[PDB]
Amino acid sequence: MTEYKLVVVGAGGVGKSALTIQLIQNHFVDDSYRKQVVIDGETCLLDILDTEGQEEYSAMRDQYMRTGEGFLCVFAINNTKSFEDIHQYREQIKRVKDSDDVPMVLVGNKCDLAARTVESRQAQDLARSYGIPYIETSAKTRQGVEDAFYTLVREIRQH
């Protein structure tokens, strides 16, 4: 069966681990993660690398990242700086993979929260300028969680 190596990147505290744990174990929180799912009738194995938001420079984090086939770029909708940093993570991904066209999905997490600081429209405009999908998610309520990982799989299938 096909294996997709997905990797979740973004600034610290945006919910990368929470999104991974909700998808894999189905509980909001507050190792290595693998799961066998069915996406558009196709049974497949998702292997998720959950990453740290800062790490100076490590050729081993670079090498581990380079193994990924698709990337969730996560910011948090009540963290304006996390949204401003998205560009840096896309640059790192491009660099690590030597490609300007890596399967990618922009993810605005914590959409259960009120008093957001980043409007949907800013992220949509950014994603549509990158030509990648934009999904809003909540690891608490689970809205969007499977949407973002499965959409990223679809970005890989259709690459």
CA separation for the pair 47, 36 (Å, rounded): 9
Q: Of 1, 5, 7, 17, which lies in the binding site for Mg ion, with binding defined by CB under 5 A?
A: 17
Cβ-based nearer residue to ligand GNP, 72 or 102: 72
Q: Which residues are near ligand GNP by CB under 6 A? A: 12-18, 29-30, 52-53, 109-110, 112-113, 138-140
Range in contact with Mg ion (rule: CB under 5 A) among 11-19, 25-33, 96-104, 115-123: 11-19
Q: How far is the CB of 79 from Mg ion (least distance, A)?
A: 14
Q: How far is the CB of 77 from ligand GNP (least distance, A)?
A: 9
Q: How far is the CB of 51 from Mg ion (least distance, A)?
A: 8
String of DSSP letters for the chain: -EEEEEEEE-STTSSHHHHHHHHHH-------EEEEEEETTEEEEEEEEE--S--S--HHHHHHHHT-SEEEEEEETT-HHHHHTHHHHHHHHHHHHT-S---EEEEEE-TT-SS-SS-HHHHHHHHHHHT--EEE--TTT-TTHHHHHHHHHHHHHT-
Q: How far is the CB of 53 from Mg ion (least distance, A)?
A: 7
Cβ-based nearer residue to ligand GNP, 16 or 97: 16
Query: Which of Mg ion, ligand GNP, none sits in contact with 12, Cβ below 5 to 8 A by type?
Result: ligand GNP
Binding site for Mg ion (CB under 5 A): 16-17
